[PDB]
Specification:
The structure is cut from a larger assembly and holds chains A (57 residues) and B (69 residues). The termini of chain A are far apart. Chain A contains no helices and no strands. With 57 residues, chain A is largely without helices or strands. The radius of gyration of chain A is 31 Å and the shape is elongated. In chain B, 51% of the residues lie in helices and 0% in strands. Chain B starts with 8 loop residues before the first helix and ends in a 26-residue tail after the last helix. Chain B has 1 helix and no strands. In chain B, 0% of the residues are buried. The longest helix of chain B is centred in the middle third of the chain and has 35 residues. Chain B is rod-shaped and about 100 Å long. Chain B has 69 residues and is mainly alpha-helical. The chains are: A little secondary structure (57), B mainly alpha (69). At the A-B interface, loops of A face helix 1 of B. It is classed as proton transport.
Chain lengths: 57, 69
């Protein structure tokens, strides 16, 4: 009394109840590098113009 | 002549003082710009001189056909 499965029955995804713990580091990866800091604060106006050897504006 | 045309010596003195202060601030800011550009190009951890790398959003996180990856 074993039933031959229909088309599409074996092609579906099932669930498993497993007693093993989840590995936190499957790739054996070290710590990622620290990201560079972002920009903060209000966009202040230009200090004394463009300063291109004589320009004040 | 001194009343109608020529400006007061104190006016020229304080105008020269303000001009000198502004130009000294500009020179100090330019020297700071050169120093900060040198230091943060040499270290490469600033907002400028950041040559682009590959974005990490394009990596597929789904499982593959062969699990040895």
């Amino acid at each position: 009394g074993w039933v031959r499965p229909d088309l599409g029955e074996l092609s579906k995804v099932t669930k498993v109840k497993t007693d093993r713990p989840l590995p936190e580091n499957p790739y054996h990866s070290r710590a990622r590098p620290e990201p560079n800091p972002e920009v903060e604060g209000d966009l202040k106006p230009a200090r004394h113009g463009s300063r291109l050897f004589f320009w004040t504006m | 002549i001194a009343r109608t045309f020529f400006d007061a010596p104190e006016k020229n003195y304080e105008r020269t003082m303000a001009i000198l202060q502004i130009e000294s601030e500009k020179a100090e800011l330019r020297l700071k710009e050169l120093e900060v550009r040198r230091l943060m190009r040499a270290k490469g951890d600033g907002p400028w001189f950041q040559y682009p790398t590959i974005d990490k959003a394009l990596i597929d996180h789904s499982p593959k056909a062969t699990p040895d990856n």
